[PDB]
Design an enzyme around this catalytic site. Structure first.
Site, mmCIF file in Angstrom:
data_model
loop_
_atom_site.group_PDB
_atom_site.id
_atom_site.type_symbol
_atom_site.label_atom_id
_atom_site.label_comp_id
_atom_site.label_asym_id
_atom_site.label_seq_id
_atom_site.Cartn_x
_atom_site.Cartn_y
_atom_site.Cartn_z
ATOM 1 N N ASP A 19 1.176 -1.411 -0.104
ATOM 2 C CA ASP A 19 0.211 -0.121 -0.449
ATOM 3 C C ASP A 19 1.713 1.305 0.222
ATOM 4 O OD1 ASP A 19 -2.848 -0.707 1.082
ATOM 5 O OD2 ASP A 19 -1.627 -2.070 2.246
ATOM 6 N N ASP A 46 -3.929 -3.793 5.762
ATOM 7 C CA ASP A 46 -4.800 -3.494 6.820
ATOM 8 C C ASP A 46 -6.335 -3.781 6.735
ATOM 9 O OD1 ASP A 46 -5.800 -0.637 9.296
ATOM 10 O OD2 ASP A 46 -4.579 -2.578 9.639
ATOM 11 N N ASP A 80 -8.698 -6.714 4.753
ATOM 12 C CA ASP A 80 -7.249 -7.451 3.674
ATOM 13 C C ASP A 80 -7.098 -8.589 4.446
ATOM 14 O OD1 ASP A 80 -7.718 -4.999 2.567
ATOM 15 O OD2 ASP A 80 -6.114 -4.053 3.155
#
Ligand SMILES: C/C=C(/C)C(=O)O[C@H]1C(C)=C2[C@H]([C@@H]1OC(=O)CCCCCCC)[C@@](C)(OC(C)=O)C[C@H](OC(=O)CCC)[C@@]1(O)[C@H]2OC(=O)[C@@]1(C)O
Ligand SMILES: CC(=O)C1=C(O)N2[C@@H](C1=O)[C@@H]1c3c[nH]c4cccc(c34)C[C@@H]1C2(C)C
Length: 994
Positions: A351, A703, A707
């Site tokens: 990310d 997170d 996820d």
């Protein structure tokens, strides 16, 4: 169980034929409870009972060493020679090692916390309902909540099930949906249907998700789904449906397990096939059960010779010292076996926000309209200095400080940024730096307004506490914020309805203040502000604005851009209804464009370099980000995922573009992709499957419960230290500092650790090859028992066990991150290395046998019958080759065995040195490169004297080999192993491998 956030409140009531006022009847409750079960995730039955251990013993190389434990116990009863009570420790020591390797082996407290377990935390015990049997608010076990029953929720409550909101009794409903995302800032709910059958959770403005909790207000709704059918339970199931493969090493050790068991019971038949002597030679005497004890003796000798006991302890210790080391470097590795798979990582999907970047937004650039003459329009552009949240820095024009209040449009620019804003700024007295209060993007603006002091408020005489929100306050003094129309992804903007605090400056009616993504906002601008005047929007104008927005977002300095505009004459206060969120866009219509702000969330100081480190390590890095594709590709260039100017068309996809691809084309996209923008709910999980389909060891960052299935799925799930409880447990590694470089650094550590393991695994088994090759020779083609099990148990635990642990501390190879990732199926030992170890085991096989047999031919001081031919007879019932002499005990003497042990200990010391490197000579890569190994070599040889001198101990083993001539032959029989290996070690000069 409904499939509708997309239905009216009526429709849902009618679905279950419930009344909003009476709720479900006792019979309905019964009917429903039967149709749908209780509101609960299934129980997990793999609990903490002794099953742990009975499994631990279920393995082959455990059973084989346990069968040989029983055989050892039966043998330790029937005895001759000196009928001593000390030989009872022999079947007792194996049992102790079988216990010690079990207890420490069954260390599933590391796996005691499983991620599906952690999911119970978010189902509350209690919920409140409005059933027909009481007019009051029955507060029941959440468990007994059924779809269709009317539920009640208020501030503080954990949401008991997936609920379709029906009525908000308070002025506003806010829910905290962090368990899903991690994105603390709570969201607003509404009642209107969300008509898209396929709306993502983010956009289901009318639903409450089980496990989530209410931040503000009170609402009544109708339960739509429960148990596994809620959002959270669907995540549970995906996690239940994914099974973990074993780490590529754990797999080898099982494969070696099976192949060892095969070799062991392939010698037992060979021994029997070579022993067609007993079946024809010993005419009689009762040796049928007295000679079958001999095969049971070599059985336990064959087992322990092969089984590389204590390797469990060595690898476990090695890994345990790996975890400690990785922690210092901010990588918390939850599970021990992981430090291996970590070393193999061929892909990192990370990310962007707070991992590749710092998540510290600051506004750098901003513009407003300068002039609009016919079909030409110019802008006024400004930089802003200082990247922190401190109101410390300057607006400048043409690189030179200017005064923002001198620009009418900057005034309004600042007005909007301060009014159309739910955040603020706070000076932390303790740390000595300012602080965001809310969303980072929003605070970036507050800081901006602080720097542009449009109304010229005196600030240098102010407290660093007042200073924080000084100028924003001045703007709030000026315009009363009535209500506010929240963000929504559907229109990508947010407005704010404001009235003039009766100061009477611009006292011409109410004003909405709109800020959002540039495209949508600009599309709803009929007007352009030019200073204080207002002129119609036109193509040329709109082209200019968009043109510069494009430059800032896709250029070298990568700025996310907000358009800001105001609705000059907003609809009547009364004519708006604030409950209709689909109605929000039309309220934000007939706008006047005012300006644009461009803000940066800077690439973390170390990523640029770390990514390069991955290039060299042959590790793909994939950026997952919420940026629009344009900026995704830009940021990727900036941090070096893409060359400053390279072709990248087929290499980066939006989440929508991915979706348009057929399955196969999707699969093929993932073996090439380096950047994914605006990825959807499913995608992470799909990305991991496809990557695995190409046999890639995958690191995946995430997170939230959102996820968790992806982190479960990926060989390396990676949570942020600042992340949710659940993402944390679902992960195979936690990043304590949220930094990308910690992954990369953890990868290097894993390659470093494994490299030594390869060496110490290989060395430790290399000894066992010898032990078997030795024990065979001292059974088949010769009888004089050279080594007894007890000795080997102590050899395989301590004498080899210390140098084995010391190799665990070998100095990291110099080029680890300049070679590609290791193949998971790459065997530790084959090709040339097989023949190498096939020879070393053979050599030592003939050394310990040879030094036991030499005790007969040569030995000066102490028993020495030259060509005694103990191979001939061992039974001693005849004594005819020996005419007249009491001698028949030198056969089981505690002296010719002390020769072999001294050889075995000594060869393994050379073979420990030999095992410092794979290919480099000891004169190129010296024995003194590892100080802990020399320290172990010393301690290993030192403890060898201990069990040979201090009396209690040389009772369970043998007697001291005093003579230096005797120790000279030990060195002259053992030290040439260096020489053999060395020849073979660098025959690789010719064998063109290295
Ligand atoms: C413990 C002692 C021995 C001799 C045992 O048989 O190890 C074998 C064995 C099971 C393997 C072999 C051994 O093979 C032999 O030694 C041939 C038999 C000759 C014996 C003489 C006849 C009396 C290992 C030990 O040694 C040699 C000489 O190359 C290497 C390696 O083992 C590993 O790499 C373990 C890594 C997890 C494995 O060939 C492995 O089987 C596999 O599947 C492998 C691929 O793994
Ligand atoms: C090479 C190899 O595969 C193995 C090993 O080398 N070890 C382990 C093992 O399986 C066994 C070990 C794991 N768990 C237990 C419980 C009880 C006893 C043992 C073990 C000993 C096993 C041993 C030593 C063969």
């Amino acid at each position: 169980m409904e499939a509708a956030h997309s239905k009216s409140t009526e429709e849902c009531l009618a679905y279950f034929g419930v009344s909003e006022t009476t709720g479900l009847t006792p019979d309905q409750v019964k009917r429903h409870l039967e149709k749908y079960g209780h509101n609960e995730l299934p129980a997990e039955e793999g609990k903490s009972l002794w099953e742990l251990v009975i499994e631990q013993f279920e393995d082959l190389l455990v059973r084989i060493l346990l069968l040989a434990a029983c055989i050892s116990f039966v043998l330790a009863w029937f005895e001759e020679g000196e009928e001593t009570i000390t030989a009872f420790v022999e079947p007792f020591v194996i049992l102790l090692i079988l216990i010690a390797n079990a207890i420490v082996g069954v260390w599933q407290e590391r796996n005691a916390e499983n991620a599906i377990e952690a999911l119970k935390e978010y189902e509350p015990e209690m919920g409140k309902v409005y059933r027909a049997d009481r007019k009051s608010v029955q507060r029941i076990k959440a468990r007994d909540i059924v779809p269709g029953d009317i539920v009640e929720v208020a501030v503080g409550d954990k949401v008991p099930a997936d609920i379709r909101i029906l009525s908000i009794k308070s002025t506003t409903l806010r829910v905290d949906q962090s368990i899903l995302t991690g994105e603390s800032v709570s969201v607003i709910k509404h009642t209107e249907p969300v008509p898209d059958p396929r709306a993502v959770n983010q956009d289901k403005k009318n639903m409450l998700f089980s496990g989530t909790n209410i931040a503000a207000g009170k609402a009544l709704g109708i339960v739509a789904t429960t148990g596994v059918s809620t959002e959270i339970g669907k995540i549970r199931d995906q996690m239940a449906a994914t099974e973990q493969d074993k780490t590529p090493l754990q797999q080898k050790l099982d494969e070696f397990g099976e192949q060892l068991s095969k070799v062991i019971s392939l010698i037992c038949v060979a021994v029997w096939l070579i022993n067609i002597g007993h079946f024809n030679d010993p005419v009689h005497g009762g040796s049928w059960i007295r000679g079958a004890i001999y095969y049971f003796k070599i059985a336990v000798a064959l087992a322990v010779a092969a089984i590389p006991e204590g390797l469990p302890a060595v690898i476990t210790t090695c890994l345990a010292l790996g975890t400690r080391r990785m922690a210092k470097k901010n990588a918390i590795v939850r599970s021990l076996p992981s430090v291996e798979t970590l070393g193999c990582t061929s892909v990192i999907c990370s990310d962007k926000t707070g991992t590749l970047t710092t998540n510290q937004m600051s506004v750098c650039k901003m513009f407003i309209i300068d002039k609009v003459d016919g079909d030409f329009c110019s802008l006024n552009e400004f930089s802003i200095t200082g990247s922190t949240y401190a109101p410390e820095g300057e607006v400048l024009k043409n690189d030179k400080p200017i005064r923002s209040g001198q620009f009418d449009g900057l005034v309004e620019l600042a007005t909007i940024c301060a009014l159309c804003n739910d955040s603020s700024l706070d000076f932390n007295e303790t740390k000595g730096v300012y602080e965001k209060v809310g969303e980072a993007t929003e605070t970036a603006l507050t800081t901006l307004v602080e720097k542009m002091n449009v109304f010229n408020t005196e600030v240098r005489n102010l407290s660093k506490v007042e200073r924080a929100n000084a100028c924003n306050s001045v703007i709030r003094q000026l315009m009363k914020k009535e209500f506010t129309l929240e963000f929504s992804r559907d229109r990508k903007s947010m407005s704010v309805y404001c009235s003039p605090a009766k100061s009477s400056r611009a006292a011409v009616g109410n004003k909405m203040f709109v800020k959002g993504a540039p495209e949508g906002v600009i599309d709803r601008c009929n007007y352009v502000r030019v200073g204080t005047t207002r002129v119609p929007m036109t193509g040329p104008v709109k082209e200019k604005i968009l043109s510069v927005i494009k430059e800032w977002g896709t250029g070298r300095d990568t700025l996310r851009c907000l358009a800001l505009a105001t609705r000059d004459t907003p609809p009547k206060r009364e004519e708006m209804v604030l409950d209709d969120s689909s109605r929000f866009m039309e309220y934000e219509t007939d706008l006047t464009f005012v300006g644009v702000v461009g803000m940066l969330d800077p690439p973390r100081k170390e990523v640029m370099g770390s990514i390069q480190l991955c290039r060299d390590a042959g590790i793909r890095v994939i950026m997952i980000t919420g940026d629009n594709k344009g900026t995704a590709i830009a940021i990727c260039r900036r941090i070096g995922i893409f060359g400053e100017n390279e072709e990248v068309a087929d290499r980066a996809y939006t989440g929508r573009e991915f979706d348009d691809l057929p399955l196969a084309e999707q699969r093929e996209a993932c073996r090439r992709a380096c950047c994914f923008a605006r990825v959807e709910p499913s995608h992470k999980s799909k990305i991991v499957e496809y990557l695995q389909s190409y046999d890639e060891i995958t690191a995946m960052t995430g997170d939230g419960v959102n996820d968790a299935p992806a982190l479960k799925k990926a060989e390396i799930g990676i949570a942020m230290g600042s992340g949710t409880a659940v993402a944390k447990t679902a992960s195979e590694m936690v990043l304590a500092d949220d930094n990308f470089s910690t992954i990369v650094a953890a990868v290097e550590e894993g390659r470093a650790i494994y490299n030594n393991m390869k060496q110490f695994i290989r060395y430790l088994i290399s000894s066992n090859v010898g032990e078997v090759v030795c024990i065979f020779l001292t059974a088949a083609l010769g009888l004089p028992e050279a080594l007894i099990p007890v000795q080997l148990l102590w050899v395989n635990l301590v004498t080899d066990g210390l140098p084995a642990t010391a190799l665990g501390f070998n100095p990291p190879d110099l080029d680890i991150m300049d070679r590609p990732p290791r193949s998971p199926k790459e065997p530790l030992i084959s090709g040339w290395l097989f023949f190498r170890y096939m020879a070393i085991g053979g050599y030592v096989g003939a050394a310990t046998v040879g030094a036991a047999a030499w005790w007969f031919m040569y030995a000066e001081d102490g028993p020495g019958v030259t060509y005694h031919q103990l191979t001939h007879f061992m039974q001693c019932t005849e004594d005819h080759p020996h005419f007249e002499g009491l001698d028949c005990e030198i056969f089981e003497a505690p002296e010719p065995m002390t020769m072999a042990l001294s050889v075995l200990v000594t060869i393994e010391m050379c073979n420990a040195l030999n095992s410092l490197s794979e290919n480099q000579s000891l004169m190129r890569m010296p024995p003194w490169v590892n100080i802990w190994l020399l320290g172990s070599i010393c301690l290993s040889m030192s403890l060898h004297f201990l069990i040979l001198y201090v009396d209690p101990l040389p009772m369970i083993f043998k007697l001291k080999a005093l003579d230096l001539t005797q120790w000279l032959m030990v060195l002259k029989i053992s030290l040439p192993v260096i020489g053999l290996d060395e020849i073979l070690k660098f025959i690789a000069r010719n064998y063109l491998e290295g």
